[PDB]
């Protein structure tokens, strides 16, 4: 699909077989989801950007479907204000910027 | 061009006569540059990011050339960690996401 940028590029994702809305964010190295009680082992991590850093939990090899495209990789969880799909998963679904 | 996302999507811009490197950022509503001088009137504004809120200076109707494409629009200047081209200008240069 082609997603224009007039509005925030929010799409449906599936993690755990369940659906969420997430922002396709070419300005994010990593994927970070709003706080959710995901099972599995995790490691603490700090992620930063405008306004400083937040503490998150890093989960590895988590399957995630993005607009019907399967992906699997590292998923961070913490107090982000919006679910964010970063480049680690954007590359897996073959996403490009085009102009 | 078509830009893949295995690396940060960094491009050269020209603004106020000067060259800089900036990140093409679909996760940003606005364009935010690191501290610099720009001519003309500015307004104090605040914006949010992953870590919280920061203070910026808003310059309106600023010409900016992005990877060879012309835009004229709002540029925010403040303590961002990286120069960011957001959707306000990505739309002007005809940028879309594709997968």
């Amino acid at each position: 699909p082609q997603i224009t940028l007039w509005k925030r590029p929010l799409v449906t994702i599936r993690i755990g077989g369940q659906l969420k809305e997430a922002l396709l964010n070419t300005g994010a190295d990593d994927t970070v989801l709003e706080e959710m009680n995901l099972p599995g082992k995790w490691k603490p991590k700090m992620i930063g950007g405008i306004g400083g850093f937040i503490k998150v939990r890093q989960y590895d090899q988590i399957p995630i479907e993005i607009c019907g495209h399967k992906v699997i990789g590292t998923v961070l969880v913490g107090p982000t204000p919006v679910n964010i799909i970063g480049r680690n998963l954007l590359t897996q679904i073959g996403c490009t910027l085009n102009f | 061009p078509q830009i893949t996302l295995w690396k940060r999507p960094l491009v050269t811009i020209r603004i106020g006569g000067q060259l800089k490197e900036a990140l093409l950022n679909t996760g940003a509503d606005d364009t935010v540059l690191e501290e610099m001088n720009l001519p003309g009137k500015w307004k104090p504004k605040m914006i949010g990011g992953i870590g919280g809120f920061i203070k910026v200076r808003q310059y309106d109707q600023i010409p900016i050339e992005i990877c060879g494409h012309k835009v004229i629009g709002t540029v925010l200047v403040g303590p961002t960690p990286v120069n960011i081209i957001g959707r306000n200008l990505l739309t002007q240069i005809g940028c879309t996401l594709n997968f």
């Binding site: 990593d30 950007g49 405008i50 970063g86 | 950022n25 940003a28 949010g48 990011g49 960690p81």
Partner: peptide
């Protein structure tokens, strides 16, 4: 390094 450049108006 800082690496999540979410940015929102308001």
């Amino acid at each position: 390094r800082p690496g999540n450049f979410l940015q929102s108006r308001l």
